[PDB]
Design an enzyme around this catalytic site. Structure first.
Site, PDB file in Angstrom:
ATOM      1  N   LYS B 106       0.822  -1.198   0.000  1.00 41.45           N
ATOM      2  CA  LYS B 106       0.000   0.000   0.000  1.00 41.45           C
ATOM      3  C   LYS B 106       0.857   1.249   0.000  1.00 41.45           C
ATOM      4  N   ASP B 234     -10.640   4.871  13.685  1.00 38.00           N
ATOM      5  CA  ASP B 234     -11.091   4.779  12.280  1.00 38.00           C
ATOM      6  C   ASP B 234     -10.562   3.572  11.502  1.00 38.00           C
ATOM      7  OD1 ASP B 234     -13.086   7.035  11.386  1.00 38.00           O
ATOM      8  OD2 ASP B 234     -11.630   8.056  12.681  1.00 38.00           O
TER       9      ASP B 234
HETATM   10  C1  IBI Z   1      -3.056  -2.132   3.543  1.00 35.77           C
HETATM   11  C2  IBI Z   1      -4.270  -1.456   4.190  1.00 35.77           C
HETATM   12  C3  IBI Z   1      -5.226  -2.512   4.778  1.00 35.77           C
HETATM   13  C4  IBI Z   1      -4.532  -3.251   5.795  1.00 35.77           C
HETATM   14  O1  IBI Z   1      -4.076  -2.655   6.791  1.00 35.77           O
HETATM   15  N1  IBI Z   1      -4.347  -4.600   5.668  1.00 35.77           N
HETATM   16  C5  IBI Z   1      -3.638  -5.331   6.770  1.00 35.77           C
HETATM   17  C6  IBI Z   1      -4.855  -5.295   4.602  1.00 35.77           C
HETATM   18  C7  IBI Z   1      -4.611  -6.664   4.435  1.00 35.77           C
HETATM   19  N2  IBI Z   1      -5.173  -7.354   3.337  1.00 35.77           N
HETATM   20  C8  IBI Z   1      -5.935  -6.704   2.441  1.00 35.77           C
HETATM   21  N3  IBI Z   1      -6.432  -7.408   1.405  1.00 35.77           N
HETATM   22  C9  IBI Z   1      -7.444  -6.981   0.617  1.00 35.77           C
HETATM   23  C10 IBI Z   1      -8.308  -5.915   0.904  1.00 35.77           C
HETATM   24  C11 IBI Z   1      -9.330  -5.577   0.006  1.00 35.77           C
HETATM   25  C12 IBI Z   1      -9.503  -6.297  -1.187  1.00 35.77           C
HETATM   26  C13 IBI Z   1     -10.526  -5.978  -2.089  1.00 35.77           C
HETATM   27  O2  IBI Z   1     -11.657  -5.716  -1.673  1.00 35.77           O
HETATM   28  N4  IBI Z   1     -10.191  -6.018  -3.403  1.00 35.77           N
HETATM   29  C14 IBI Z   1     -11.162  -5.744  -4.489  1.00 35.77           C
HETATM   30  C15 IBI Z   1     -10.597  -4.761  -5.574  1.00 35.77           C
HETATM   31  C16 IBI Z   1      -9.860  -5.457  -6.749  1.00 35.77           C
HETATM   32  C17 IBI Z   1     -10.678  -6.641  -7.292  1.00 35.77           C
HETATM   33  N5  IBI Z   1     -10.144  -7.187  -8.572  1.00 35.77           N
HETATM   34  C18 IBI Z   1      -9.057  -8.189  -8.408  1.00 35.77           C
HETATM   35  C19 IBI Z   1      -8.646  -8.829  -9.745  1.00 35.77           C
HETATM   36  N6  IBI Z   1      -9.818  -9.394 -10.445  1.00 35.77           N
HETATM   37  C20 IBI Z   1      -9.412 -10.067 -11.694  1.00 35.77           C
HETATM   38  C21 IBI Z   1      -9.695 -11.576 -11.650  1.00 35.77           C
HETATM   39  C22 IBI Z   1     -10.233 -12.179 -12.940  1.00 35.77           C
HETATM   40  C23 IBI Z   1      -8.795 -12.438 -12.526  1.00 35.77           C
HETATM   41  C24 IBI Z   1     -10.797  -8.326 -10.723  1.00 35.77           C
HETATM   42  C25 IBI Z   1     -11.269  -7.656  -9.421  1.00 35.77           C
HETATM   43  C26 IBI Z   1     -10.832  -7.674  -6.163  1.00 35.77           C
HETATM   44  C27 IBI Z   1     -11.719  -7.080  -5.069  1.00 35.77           C
HETATM   45  C28 IBI Z   1      -8.652  -7.366  -1.465  1.00 35.77           C
HETATM   46  C29 IBI Z   1      -7.625  -7.699  -0.576  1.00 35.77           C
HETATM   47  O3  IBI Z   1      -6.766  -8.740  -0.818  1.00 35.77           O
HETATM   48  C30 IBI Z   1      -6.289  -8.786  -2.176  1.00 35.77           C
HETATM   49  N7  IBI Z   1      -6.160  -5.386   2.605  1.00 35.77           N
HETATM   50  C31 IBI Z   1      -5.661  -4.675   3.637  1.00 35.77           C
HETATM   51  N8  IBI Z   1      -5.929  -3.357   3.712  1.00 35.77           N
HETATM   52  C32 IBI Z   1      -6.882  -2.790   2.665  1.00 35.77           C
HETATM   53  C33 IBI Z   1      -7.723  -1.585   3.106  1.00 35.77           C
HETATM   54  C34 IBI Z   1      -6.153  -2.422   1.363  1.00 35.77           C
END
Ligand code: IBI
Ligand code: IBI
Lengths: 303, 303
Positions: B106, B234
């Protein structure tokens, strides 16, 4: 340990690693002869055990020197290992040799660096033409090191001597009109550096067959004439004799300057002969064209 | 390709390589929390195919983050491979995920970086105390990238979701008094991001046994109270549901946030639940102590 040495090792490691990701083309472009890579490292409260905290490493023309290594039958991974798996050893101009005795590392001046840049393209083309078969120094890398305040330049060459076989006697020959002789302080070392009159006084003979001699002198002729046309002078023939009876077969693919003695040689000897110290050095100081023929005549007479 | 991405990959590769030469002690020193390594690279007419010609890479507190990786069961060679063997994939604040889906990358602000530094020691000590078992973000690396003009900051965390098992529904829950709802533009994506009222409207149930629930909420309690005492608010609970019937066993050693559904669950489901977005962000803008209990109550009710 020597912090300049560890920057050198770090830098060569970094250099070769970077090139492992760069595509090798068959040809060099004019810009490759003007290229460099610069890396500046600043560690704050980190990694004090291995590295100085502030250092710079600069490699001149990395693509040209990689191309030269390949042309000299040297693999980059091997070169890297030779320079990095263990520290290079000192000798006292001063120099180091890689732990495996394959390569020499010499500290040079910014003037020498300017001169090397000046001749690099012509040097490269000469090596292309002779297919890497030459008695010239084999230039393998050129670097600038900075460790908080101090700045040094180094060049890396293939060792003229063998990487296994020990040398019991060594000559530095120029064939000059002005008398050349070794000193007694040098004599007192395990392997001194003798000169023209030591050879032409102790009745030194080099026992090689007429074929080996002809090949050698042909090579020498071309090398020296190339040096002449670059206006270079004050280089030497380095001669090292390995006595098999004291310490005897060598690998011509590694010890590329070796020549076996002929079958009727009084002792079992191996000779290592190459040109060294080809750059000008404006700190030391009759013309280049005269120097060459004079150098070529002397080597003709002694061999 | 993205030149900031290739600097990130180069930098992580360089970072991990450097640390492979650094001795790992069991303990951190106060200075390790103030440490960094800085590398500035300038290539002139060299290596244009792979790298921008001028870039900088800075790693914050490399020893602390290595210690964190180890505590989170992550090997440095594996971390390196995940981030470097192939490029991270984009998503559109914006983020990337490592090619193997194990890690999230990120982009953060210099303000976030200042805040991370502010909490890093306390964060580290908390992770020591809970033996790495936590629903907090697992912070694995923090870097600054410069590519001729542009400067960005990145943080790397373990993925909350599985590295194999796909997620068909995702919730971001805060439990706030102010109404929270997803938008229709987001709905139109393959996997949208639903919110509090989506959950408390579509009658979402999480089917886990009373033991799993108790363990989870105990963990959540401690994590949230730690966040409260740092004056952080938050943050969200991220919830992802994997439907086995559509795509189902996971490795708890890799997918560390996974919880199996109990035996009487209407569908074969796996849940992935963790806290995310814990830093302040002074660009967005009722107190931290109130936020926590309010967050803790909501998660109590929905589970
Ligand atoms: C770093 C800040 C914080 C944090 O502190 N930790 C610890 C954290 C840890 N892990 C995550 N993971 C995910 C969070 C959210 C998502 C999501 O909704 N993604 C959507 C958007 C892209 C979409 N695309 C993917 C490819 N697809 C193509 C397919 C056909 C092949 C088409 C559709 C998939 C769904 C996915 C995660 O995993 C990939 N996020 C974190 N955040 C988040 C706020 C960013
Ligand atoms: C780079 C410039 C130029 C050049 O252009 N090329 C291409 C080149 C190529 N190759 C060499 N090699 C050597 C040149 C000279 C010597 C020597 O007399 N060294 C002496 C001094 C140290 C002595 N020490 C060694 C360790 N001993 C310890 C033993 C007990 C374990 C104790 C005694 C050994 C004898 C040795 C070489 O090999 C190790 N030199 C070159 N030069 C030279 C002018 C430096």
């Amino acid at each position: 340990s020597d912090p300049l040495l560890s920057v050198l090792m770090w830098g060569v490691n970094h250099s070769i690693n970077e090139l492992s990701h760069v595509q090798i083309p068959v040809m060099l472009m004019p810009d490759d002869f003007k290229a460099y890579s610069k890396i500046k490292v600043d560690n704050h409260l980190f990694n004090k055990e291995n590295m100085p905290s502030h250092f710079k490493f600069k490699e001149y023309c990395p693509m040209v020197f990689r191309n030269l290594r390949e042309r000299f039958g040297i693999d980059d991974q091997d070169f890297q290992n030779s320079l990095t798996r263990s520290a290079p050893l000192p000798n006292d101009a001063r120099f180091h040799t890689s732990y495996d005795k394959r390569y020499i590392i010499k500290t040079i001046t910014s003037e020498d660096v300017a001169e090397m840049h000046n001749i690099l393209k012509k040097y490269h083309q000469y090596i292309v033409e002779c297919h890497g078969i030459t008695l010239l120094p084999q230039f393998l890398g050129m670097y600038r090191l900075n460790v908080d305040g101090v700045e040094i330049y180094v060049i890396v060459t293939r060792n003229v001597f063998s990487h296994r076989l020990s040398v019991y006697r060594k000559y530095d020959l120029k064939g000059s009109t002005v008398a050349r002789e070794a000193s007694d302080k040098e004599k007192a070392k395990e392997l001194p550096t003798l000169k023209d009159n030591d050879f032409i006084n102790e009745g030194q003979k080099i026992y090689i067959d007429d074929n080996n001699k002809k090949v050698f002198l042909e090579k020498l002729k071309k090398d020296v004439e190339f040096l002449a046309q670059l206006k270079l002078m004050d280089y030497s023939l380095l001669v090292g004799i390995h006595d098999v009876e004291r310490a005897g077969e060598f690998d011509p693919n590694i010890d590329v300057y070796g020549i076996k003695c002929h079958e009727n040689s009084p002792r079992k000897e191996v000779y290592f002969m190459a040109i060294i110290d080809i750059l000008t050095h404006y700190d030391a100081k009759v013309n280049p064209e005269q120097y060459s023929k004079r150098f070529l005549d002397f080597i003709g007479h002694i061999l």
